[PDB]
């Protein structure tokens, strides 16, 4: 009734795209700490019984092809779909190693009318990437059943620690480990919001970038409650 059916034979795929190293011509810096995020996510989603696939350093062309191909798989026996994007970004954009891809192009492959074996199932996009440069201091809609878990507010930078991993992914994995067997997903993500907002503050020798804060942003078009257990 009010909760997504999560007892299909499989929980579903968890695709993790981990972009660390960028083509020199793009002028984008390497994202130290992102491997820590990717490993944490792999383990976290493994324990939730997702079929995890980790991909590293994909070009924009490879990202589009990977997402097209995954959207053409038969997901009939899968409860859900998860994609995690770790990269540089701006508002509406995630970077391949050689240039940008529109988030809309990626998510469009999974529309209710374009991926029929996921129609009615939750499609989760988890995005660790900047969204700008601001500092804080059928009879179902084709867009239904998507959830975007953004690391940061619209328009803002997102913070990544080179030693510890990103504030958002660190916090997300910690909250999933602690609460996935007991809380609905929006409530888990709310705990992630509080953790990021309260436990992290940037340290920089550059006054412009020092003592800054971050709040993640949950964007939900889900139509049911989502529990990882059943």
């Amino acid at each position: 009734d009010n909760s997504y059916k999560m007892d299909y034979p499989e929980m579903g795929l968890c695709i993790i795209i981990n972009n660390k190293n960028f083509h020199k011509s793009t002028g984008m810096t390497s994202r130290s700490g992102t491997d820590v995020d990717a490993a944490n996510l792999r383990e976290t989603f493994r324990n939730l019984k997702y079929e995890v696939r980790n991909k590293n350093d994909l070009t924009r062309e490879e990202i589009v092809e990977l997402m097209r191909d995954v959207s053409k798989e038969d997901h009939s026996k899968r409860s859900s779909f998860v994609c995690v994007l770790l990269s540089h970004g701006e508002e509406g954009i995630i970077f391949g190693t050689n240039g940008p891809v529109d988030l809309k192009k990626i998510t469009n492959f999974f529309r209710g009318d374009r991926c029929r074996s996921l129609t009615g199932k939750p499609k989760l996009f988890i995005i660790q990437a900047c969204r700008g440069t601001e500092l804080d201091c059928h009879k179902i809609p084709v867009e239904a059943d998507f959830l975007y878990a953004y690391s940061t507010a619209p328009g803002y930078y997102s913070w990544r620690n080179s030693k510890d991993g990103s504030w958002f992914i660190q916090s997300l994995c910690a909250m999933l480990k602690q609460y996935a067997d007991k809380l609905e997903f929006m409530h888990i993500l709310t705990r992630v919001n509080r953790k990021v907002a309260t436990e992290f503050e940037s340290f920089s020798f550059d006054a412009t970038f020092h003592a800054k804060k971050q709040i993640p942003c949950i964007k939900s078009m889900l139509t049911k409650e989502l529990y990882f257990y059943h």
Partner: peptide, 4 residues
């Protein structure tokens, strides 16, 4: 700490 670095930004993305």
């Amino acid at each position: 700490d670095e930004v993305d």
